[PDB]
Design a binder for this molecule. Structure first.
Ligand SMILES: [Cl-]
Ligand SMILES: [Mg+2]
Ligand SMILES: [Mg+2]
Lengths: 232, 140
């Protein structure tokens, strides 16, 4: 196959108590910025948020897989909202497994996926999987342009593992929000509106919809004349 | 003649399917279980005989869920009940996958009914040894 309606970067990072993840609300269609109400952050329970870029139809598929997973985890499970609720690490292994089986049948799910969440024991979970089955974990994870522009900025806050306990939700969220602006400056397939999620071992799942890039700097554009010799 | 109650899909000369009626006997020997319909829902309740103080209390659950809106309880051969419920879960998934809306309660009844009726059609299977009470809230 070959992708059609698509969504761009998904960026994320770990901090002292949880993880943050964000992605803009756009479904592009080739170069037509066709759909604008598109949520690409899928919460699963109260402790996992799965962010998805790639083919939007396959994303709509992966969503229903996740709703089905929740529904069935409940079957004959009197602890499905406690000791036996779905863990982020379970939800990632499932998706990772599906992704690689699908590559291997030569019929991929045309996606990159980031699973962010908090484990039952408090540990932060943050791992990536894509249409080829490749998986990796780092203190920062991004897809699409975000790997090229977001990662260099976020890696400057949490460069090493030891930086994670030094980073606070406030620092981290600001990094994330600044990155979304960089991506809006320089990614021709991005949108000003975006969604952002925080998963904290203490405050739980905060899911912020309908953000906008603010505080852009454009004023210097008035002083840009021509392309070399032109003076006016 | 005689003989009409040893295979399943067999009509007796007075028009009955004795093997189904014998299945009811297993149901009747089961625990008592009920359903009450109210102004905006349903309640299900069941009796769990404490065979022995050795059973962990609260811990041999009998009421099963189907999808997120349907409750099922049954009397008789418990393992048959789980089977029927499993089928119900599949049948509720198929319906939602194609139609998106979660399966309406009467539509679910006929899914179960049609399947259970199916096991009175052939002498290569026996009838379900459970009577089942189930229900839920749907678009109306
Ligand atoms: Cl599978
Ligand atoms: Mg196209
Ligand atoms: Mg939205």
């Amino acid at each position: 196959q070959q992708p059609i309606v698509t969504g761009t970067s998904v960026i994320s990072m770990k901090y002292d108590n949880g993880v943050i993840i964000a992605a803009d609300n756009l479904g592009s269609y080739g170069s037509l910025l066709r759909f604008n109400g598109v949520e690409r952050l899928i919460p699963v329970g109260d402790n996992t948020v799965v962010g998805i870029s790639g083919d939007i139809s396959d994303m709509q598929h992966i969503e229903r897989l996740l709703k089905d997973l929740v529904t069935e985890n409940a079957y004959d499970n009197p602890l499905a909202d406690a000791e036996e609720a779905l863990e982020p690490s379970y939800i990632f292994e499932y998706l990772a497994t599906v992704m690689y089986q699908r590559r291997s049948k030569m019929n991929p799910l045309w996606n990159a996926i980031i699973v962010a969440g908090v484990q039952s024991n408090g540990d932060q979970f943050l791992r990536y999987v894509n249409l080829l089955g490749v998986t990796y974990s780092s203190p920062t994870l991004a897809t699409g342009f975000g790997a090229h522009m977001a990662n260099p900025l976020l890696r400057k806050v949490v460069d090493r593992e030891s930086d994670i306990p030094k980073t606070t939700v406030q620092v981290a969220e600001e990094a994330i929000v600044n990155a979304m602006r960089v991506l809006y400056y320089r990614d021709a397939r991005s949108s000003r509106n975006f969604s952002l999620a925080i998963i904290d071992k203490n405050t739980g799942l905060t899911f912020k919809k309908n953000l906008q890039v603010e505080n852009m700097k454009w004023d210097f554009a008035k002083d840009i004349k021509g392309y070399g010799t032109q003076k006016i | 003649g005689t003989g009409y109650d040893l295979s399943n899909s067999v009509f007796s000369p007075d028009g009955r399917n004795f093997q189904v009626e014998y299945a009811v006997k297993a149901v009747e020997n089961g625990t008592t279980s009920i359903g009450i319909k109210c102004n905006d829902g349903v309640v299900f309740a069941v009796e769990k005989l404490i065979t022995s103080k050795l059973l962990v209390p609260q811990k041999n659950v009998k009421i099963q869920v189907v999808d997120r809106h349907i409750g099922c309880v049954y009397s008789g051969l418990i393992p048959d009940g789980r089977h029927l419920v499993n089928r119900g879960r599949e049948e509720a998934a198929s319906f939602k996958k194609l139609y998106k809306t979660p399966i309406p309660i009467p539509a679910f009844a006929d899914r179960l009914g049609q399947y259970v009726q199916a096991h009175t059609l052939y002498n290569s299977v026996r009838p379900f040894g459970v009577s089942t009470i189930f229900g839920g809230v749907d678009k109306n």
